[PDB]
Structure formats: structure tokens, C-alpha cells
Amino acid sequence: GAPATVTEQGEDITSKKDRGVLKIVKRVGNGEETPMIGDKVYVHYKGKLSNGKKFDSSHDRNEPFVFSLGKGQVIKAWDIGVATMKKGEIAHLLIKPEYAYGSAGSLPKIPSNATLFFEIELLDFKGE
Numbered sequence: 108g109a110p111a112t113v114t115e116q117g118e119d120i121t122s123k124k125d126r127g128v129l130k131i132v133k134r135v136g137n138g139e140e141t142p143m144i145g146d147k148v149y150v151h152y153k154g155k156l157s158n159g160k161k162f163d164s165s166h167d168r169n170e171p172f173v174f175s176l177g178k179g180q181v182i183k184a185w186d187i188g189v190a191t192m193k194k195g196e197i198a199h200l201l202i203k204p205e206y207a208y209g210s211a212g213s214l215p216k217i218p219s220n221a222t223l224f225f226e227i228e229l230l231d232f233k234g235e
């Protein structure tokens with residue numbers, strides 16, 4: 108169970124060391140450059156509630172998913188986790204609601220106090 112594997116085996120990459128974002132690297136990337144805040148980043152991802160109840164993929168949309176790192180165009184967890192990644196890396200994230208959609212949730216897709224699981228591949232990142 109990919110979400111459980113990440114609970115057991117994930118690195119806590121939070122500042123406050125609150126196990127709110129957990130990470131395993133599943134495939135290794137290239138170089139030592141990782142993206143800085145304001146970098147434009149290209150990814151493919153597979154995502155779900157850890158309940159396994161709703162599911163989501165860039166592939167559904169038939170195209171890469173693009174955002175500006177650390178601009179809050181995504182959840183705090185993504186801005187934190189993707190920043191730790193290298194070009195070509197695949198990693199797994201398990202995320203507590205404080206780094207996702209909180210007690211307010213995001214209905215209908217996301218309920219209150221949801222935990223999320225993503226598989227993310229980083230493809231590219233160009234400077235601001």
C-alpha cells in the first residue's frame with residue numbers, strides 16, 4: 108500500500124518536523140540542481156485521498172501539469188516537496204491536511220481533514 112509504505116519509510120521534510128509531508132524517492136533524478144522559488148516546473152503526477160476514494164492524474168488531461176514553485180498556485184506540500192526534487196526524479200508524498208486542504212477541505216473533491224497521496228515525476232524546470 109503506497110500510502111502506508113510512505114508512513115513507515117518516508118523522510119519528514121517539514122521545517123517544524125511534524126510529519127506533515129513525508130517523502131520516499133522511488134526513481135532518482137539528474138544533476139544536483141533542484142528548483143528555486145519562482146521557478147516554472149513541469150510534472151506528471153498521480154494523486155488520491157489516502158482513503159483511495161477519489162483519484163486524479165495529469166494523464167487524464169493528456170498533458171503536463173505546470174505551476175510556479177512557491178507562489179501558492181498549489182498546496183503548501185507541493186511547494187515544499189517538489190523543491191526537494193531533481194530533474195527526472197519520481198517521488199511519493201504523503202500529506203497531512205495542514206499541508207493540503209485543512210479542516211475546511213475542498214468539496215466536493217476533498218473532504219475536511221483529508222490526507223493526500225501523490226506520485227510525482229519532475230520533468231523540467233526553467234528559471235522565472
Ligand SMILES: COc1cc2cc(c1OC)OCCCOCCCCCOC(=O)[C@@H]1CCCCN1C(=O)[C@H]2C1CCCCC1
Nearest residue numbers: 152154155156161162163172180181182185213216217223
Ligand atoms: C481542489 O481541486 C483539485 C485538486 C486536485 C485536482 C483537481 C482539482 O480541481 C480543481 O483537478 C485537476 C485539474 C487541475 O486543476 C488545477 C489544479 C489546482 C488545484 C490545487 O491542486 C493542488 O494543490 C494539488 C497539486 C497539483 C495537482 C492537483 N492537486 C490536488 O490536490 C488534486 C487532488 C484531486 C483529488 C485526489 C487528490 C489530488
